[PDB]
């Protein structure tokens, strides 16, 4: 039976709860890593060619079968142990699993049979393991087992541990491969250009890009040329077709123009035929191609081989790379030329770069596969060099000594540790920030960082189009969550039900198409192409079909029952262009949609009833997918579907605005991401305020993880009393915000009281703050280790002695124990030693290199942990705890972009009060509201008053007609309050009623990480830089502030020349030099002996003292190093 509209909200949140019970939130990272480990590593090992080595004896090395173990640790003893993630985090280990491989070495001598050596399970490096993946040791463990291992069961996984640091792989956007995209290059010689970044499927190789372009009108006619890989000049397209093996113009035009009754395509291909008439043979065309190669060979036959290698191996690898597969390549190149002509005629629209179905998302799988492909090539190269050396002069080589496991191990470790995605010696020419340190300030920040997408377009670009919120981002990318500043629009976040496809083999779909009446390209005359539908499988034109509608019906029926076609395969029928494109590759972002047949949902009450007992029936989300009820639609397929926003669009009368709905949104509020789903009433706010809250929800202090006592993070922040919001969204039930909340429901009165809340400020209740309101804990970890940097050098944790250690920092050392480490529970201040480390000097046999506490960061040593690092030295980590009571200048934000620092704190007797004696916890200014139009803040406050009076958690799902401001007002008036949330407040100071009535009620506030005590900084005089002798950088180094160029301009406009001289000369770097009065060069001055001598002039009396900045002296000496003579003349 059909789901009634009164049960629809409950049913749709049931199916959403089923989806998040199965998939979770970091499914894309785990799925990509599992595909990389299970399939991509073995495929990379296979596609690597066997090593053939001759001096002579012949040696053939063939890598056959990989073996991956579980993550094990080997200490200096050498006994393996099951290495746990907390052990990796605490001991600064890399959570990696050893990768073995089966190698076969065959020996081919002269007059001797082949000899087989089976080197089974040969260790070739260590693969870092994503947490909670298949090969992690936490896989399949219950929550009790995770708690017994000191792991948080709410922790999502999806990250790596590299040297004890948690690293997340940000997903990387790229243009889709194997797809023809025609653009119009502006201000160039090309009117239009077709582009195909061709990459061969089932393999990890770089993408070869071909440009089939057309020259501009400004030339008798406009001609089509081809820019091929490894070819320096542009080649006319008819020459490429002739070199492919088709000399006649009729065959080339049959490959290009499918309907010969179309004269304008003939008119536009006329100039290319006229240009390339002088070549008429395949070998002459191959000669013309090879004449413009990377290195043109002197032998014509060498040019023929090079041109054939370019046209076969490097021209469109995806349609075919083997021998005698040139007709498929010719049909694809003709299709590219046909698409170019269609764009030239205006008969087909130009492709959109920002269209997000033209983009793929490289997740951890593809990125790690690219790395491992390069490094396995490097490992085979080094094995080849070693075995070549020991077959050249010697006769035999040991294979276990040939393999350098440091290559794979340290390359993966380096690229995951630094984020530079490439090689260590080529860091400047590799993409950076692919791997980032995982944000652990809030659980919401952890989730948002684990579901983070990145456009690798430079942030210095001032064009707006990649930063714009495209239409095709609906349901795939959160429209609110983007950073502010240089990375706006470029860094994106996943929507909650968005899933990035993991990849599949096209072989079942290809076989099914072969015997479902699709005729191949090799077996058809071109005359049949004009009326038939071209079929593309992963961008490979494989054939044509005469009945495309029943073919798409059959394909959808197969995918909906999880037959031959798997669920993540995208199938798009371009009906107007007569094309069917089937995509199975990875990186396609999709989302599940309810299937609608004849204005009715296929989701019935039986599915909802079965899903209500998910843990009884064993009915899950995957059963709902297999039932043909929901299906995953990606961005390219979504451009052909007809979405009902709600089932109310289906059950509509005579003018439904559409009678051909194909899909229905499960819930529209699922278009938001993790951080935008905690906003209550987001559709009542201005959109930049939702963006600002999506930014600040990652800076909100709550309880970031459950096992924070085990962890020693460098920066950690724990609220005393985090509360779940009184006004929640239903999407917050799957972000675990009810279990790890970040904030407190606060009685907020929006009023102007004493003027101390003006310009985005809040007044806090000091009496509330005394009771623990928004009190937090700051944890800081300090790491130190003994290191044997040489035989004589020996750092050691010792309690130092004043008459024995060189160069102490005049501090106390009594709080250290005699192991050199401070004890837990000891109060520490900014000038205190917490780790006493001395290094032996090669009577002061050792000097002080003790670890000091960061200045002005008073606190108490919470924990001290002693362990062994990777290379077996003593390693200490000390967590110091400091209690942060809310202060004037601490940043606080509601969930609506209402950031603001605390301006003052009043006690309970000074704050305004209601007739029940309720004082606000926070008073905010009214003027924060009108220009912002954060009406969702007011509705959250009203709904929270209703929720706290009724004893319930208010629902603030965005698009909900059951919740209305009038309904909340009537509910509030039912509880003895004014219906609009106003109350009569009395002045705290005088007791008189405030003439206006104050809006007051519970609103969820967040304490942001930005305390004033982490930012207050003054310098009188102190440390200076070595080179320019100017003050240092930042409060952490007791540095000075920069009196920059704009400040210099402002003080010029003020006319204050002596203040300008004070700031830029004698508050930064005074210096005195002695210059010759004749040559103007700095002289040699001995001030002790009064010997002022100038070499180059024989001058010992015409020397003058000049006061200049030290940076100006350094500038003049640098100029003299550049053979410039800056001569300071005192006349």
């Amino acid at each position: 039976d059909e789901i009634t509209p009164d049960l629809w909200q409950e049913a749709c949140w049931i199916v959403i709860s089923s989806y998040f019970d199965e998939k979770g939130l970091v499914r894309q990272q785990l799925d990509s890593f599992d595909e990389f480990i299970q399939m991509s590593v073995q495929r990379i090992v296979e596609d690597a060619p066997p090593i053939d080595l001759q001096a002579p004896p012949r040696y053939l090395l063939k890598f056959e079968q990989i073996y991956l173990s579980k993550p094990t640790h080997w200490e200096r003893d050498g006994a393996p142990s099951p290495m746990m993630p907390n052990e990796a985090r605490l001991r600064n280990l890399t959570y990696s699993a050893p990768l073995y491989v089966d190698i076969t070495k065959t020996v081919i001598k002269e007059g001797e049979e082949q000899l087989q050596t089976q080197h089974q399970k040969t260790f070739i490096g260590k693969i870092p393991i994503m947490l909670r993946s298949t090969y992690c040791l936490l896989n399949g463990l219950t929550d009790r087992d995770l708690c017994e291992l000191n792991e948080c069961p709410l922790d999502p996984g999806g990250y790596f541990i590299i040297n004890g640091s948690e690293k997340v792989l940000i997903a990387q956007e790229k243009m889709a491969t194997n797809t023809v995209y025609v653009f119009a290059k502006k201000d160039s010689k090309y009117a239009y250009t077709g582009e195909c970044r061709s990459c061969l499927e089932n393999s990890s190789r770089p993408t070869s890009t071909i440009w089939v372009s057309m020259l501009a009108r400004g030339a008798i006619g406009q001609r089509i040329v081809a820019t091929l890989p490894y070819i320096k000049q542009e080649v006319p397209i008819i020459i490429v077709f002739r070199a492919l093996g088709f000399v006649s113009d009729r065959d080339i035009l049959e490959h290009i123009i499918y309907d010969f009754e179309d004269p304008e395509m003939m008119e536009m291909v006329k100039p290319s035929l006229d240009e390339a008439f002088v070549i008429q043979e395949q070998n002459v065309a191959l000669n013309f191609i090879g004449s413009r190669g990377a290195k043109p060979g002197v032998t014509k036959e060498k040019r023929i081989k090079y041109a054939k290698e370019v046209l076969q191996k490097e021209m469109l690898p995806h349609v075919g790379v083997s021998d005698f597969c040139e007709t498929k390549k010719a049909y694809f190149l003709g299709y590219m030329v046909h698409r170019l002509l269609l764009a030239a005629l205006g008969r087909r629209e130009l492709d959109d770069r920002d269209h997000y179905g033209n983009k793929r998302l490289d997740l951890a799988g593809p990125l790690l596969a690219f790395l491992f492909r390069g490094m396995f090539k490097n490992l085979l190269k080094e094995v080849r060099i070693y075995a070549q050396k020991f077959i050249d002069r010697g006769k035999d080589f040991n294979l276990e000594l040939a393999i350098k496991t440091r290559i794979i191990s340290d390359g993966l470790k380096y690229s995951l540790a630094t984020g530079n995605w490439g090689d260590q010696k080529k860091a400047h020419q590799a993409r950076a920030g692919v791997s980032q340190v995982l944000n652990r300030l809030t659980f919401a920040s952890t989730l948002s960082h684990l579901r983070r997408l990145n456009s690798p377009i430079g942030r210095d670009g001032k064009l707006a189009k990649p930063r714009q919120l495209h239409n095709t981002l609906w349901g795939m990318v959160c429209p609110a969550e983007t950073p502010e500043g240089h990375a706006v629009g470029l860094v994106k976040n996943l929507a909650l039900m968005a899933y990035i496809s993991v990849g599949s083999q096209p072989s079942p779909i290809l076989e099914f198409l072969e015997e479902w009446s699709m005729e191949n390209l090799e077996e058809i005359s071109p005359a049949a192409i004009a009326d038939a539908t071209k079929i593309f499988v992963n961008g490979c034109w494989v054939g044509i079909h005469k009945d495309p509608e029943q073919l798409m019906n059959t394909l959808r029926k197969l995918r909906r029952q999880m037959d031959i076609i798997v669920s993540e395969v995208s199938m798009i029928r371009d009906i107007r262009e007569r094309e069917i494109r089937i995509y199975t590759d990875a990186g396609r972002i999709c989302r599940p949609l309810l299937i609608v047949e004849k204005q009715k949902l296929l989701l019935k009450k039986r599915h909802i009833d079965q899903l209500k007992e998910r843990e009884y029936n064993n009915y899950s989300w995957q059963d709902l997918v297999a039932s043909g009820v929901v299906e995953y639609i990606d961005t390219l397929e979504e451009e052909t579907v007809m979405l009902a926003m709600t089932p109310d669009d289906l059950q509509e009368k005579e003018v439904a605005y559409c009678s051909t709905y194909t899909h229905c949104e499960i819930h529209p509020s699922m278009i938001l991401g993790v951080c935008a789903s905690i906003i209550p009433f987001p559709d009542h706010n201005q959109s930049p305020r939702n963006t600002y809250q999506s930014a600040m929800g990652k800076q909100a202090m709550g309880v970031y993880i459950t096992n924070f006592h085990v962890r020693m993070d460098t920066l950690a922040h724990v609220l005393y009393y985090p509360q779940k919001p009184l006004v929640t969204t239903r999407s917050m039930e799957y972000l675990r915000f009810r279990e790890l909340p970040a904030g407190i429901n606060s009685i907020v009165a929006i009023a102007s009281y004493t003027g101390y809340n003006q310009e985005d400020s809040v007044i806090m209740n000091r009496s509330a703050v005394d009771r623990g309101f928004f009190r937090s804990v700051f944890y800081r970890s300090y790491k130190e280790q003994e290191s044997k940097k040489g035989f004589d050098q020996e750092e050691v944790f010792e309690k130092p002695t004043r008459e024995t250690c060189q160069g102490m920092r005049h501090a106390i050392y009594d709080k250290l124990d005699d192991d050199g480490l401070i004890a837990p529970g000891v109060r520490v201040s900014g000038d205190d030693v917490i780790i006493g480390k001395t290094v032996t000097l090669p009577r002061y046999t050792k000097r002080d290199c003790s670890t000091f506490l960061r200045t002005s960061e008073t606190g108490i040593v919470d924990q001290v942990m002693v362990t062994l690092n990777q290379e077996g030295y003593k390693f200490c980590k000390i967590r110091v705890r400091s209690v942060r009571i809310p202060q004037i200048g601490d940043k606080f934000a509601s969930r609506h972009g209402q950031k603001g620092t605390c301006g003052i704190q009043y006690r309970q007797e000074d704050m305004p009060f209601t007739c029940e004696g309720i004082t606000p916890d926070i008073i905010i200014n009214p003027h924060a509201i009108p220009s912002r139009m954060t009406i969702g803040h007011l509705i959250e406050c009203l709904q929270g008053k209703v929720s706290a009076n009724k004893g319930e958690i208010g629902d603030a799902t965005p698009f909900n007609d059951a919740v209305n401001v009038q309904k909340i007002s009537n509910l509030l008036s039912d509880y003895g309050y004014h219906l609009r949330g106003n109350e009569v407040l009395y002045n705290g100071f005088t007791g008189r009623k405030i003439t206006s009535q104050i809006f007051i009620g519970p609103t969820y506030y967040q304490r942001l990480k930005h305390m004033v005590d982490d930012k207050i900084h003054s310098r009188a005089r102190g440390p200076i830089q070595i080179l320019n002798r100017q003050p240092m950088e930042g409060r952490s180094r007791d540095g000075g502030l920069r009196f920059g160029e704009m400040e210099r301009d402002c003080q010029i406009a003020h006319g204050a020349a002596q203040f300008l001289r004070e700031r830029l000369f004698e508050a930064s770097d005074p210096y005195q030099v002695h210059v010759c009065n004749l040559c103007g060069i700095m002289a040699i001055a001995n001030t002790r002996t009064h010997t002022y001598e100038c070499r180059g002039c024989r001058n010992k009396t015409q020397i003058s003292l000049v006061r200049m900045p030290y940076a100006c002296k350094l500038l003049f000496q640098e100029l003299m190093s550049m053979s410039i003579a800056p001569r300071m003349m005192s006349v």
């Binding site: 010696k425 080529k426 860091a427 400047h428 550049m1122």
Partner: protein
């Protein structure tokens, strides 16, 4: 190159040493000039 001119040496090795000296002096002054490889520290980072 002092060694290669104090004792006898070929013209081409002297020209190659002159080329290396010219490259080193130019990259001491200007390390971001186009057309030539950048002078790099052994860690792979270029020199300043």
């Amino acid at each position: 190159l002092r060694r290669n001119e104090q004792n006898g040496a070929a013209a081409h090795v002297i020209a190659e040493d002159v080329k290396l000296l010219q490259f080193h002096v130019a990259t001491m002054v200007d390390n971001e000039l186009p057309g030539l490889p950048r002078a790099m520290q052994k860690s792979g980072r270029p020199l300043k």
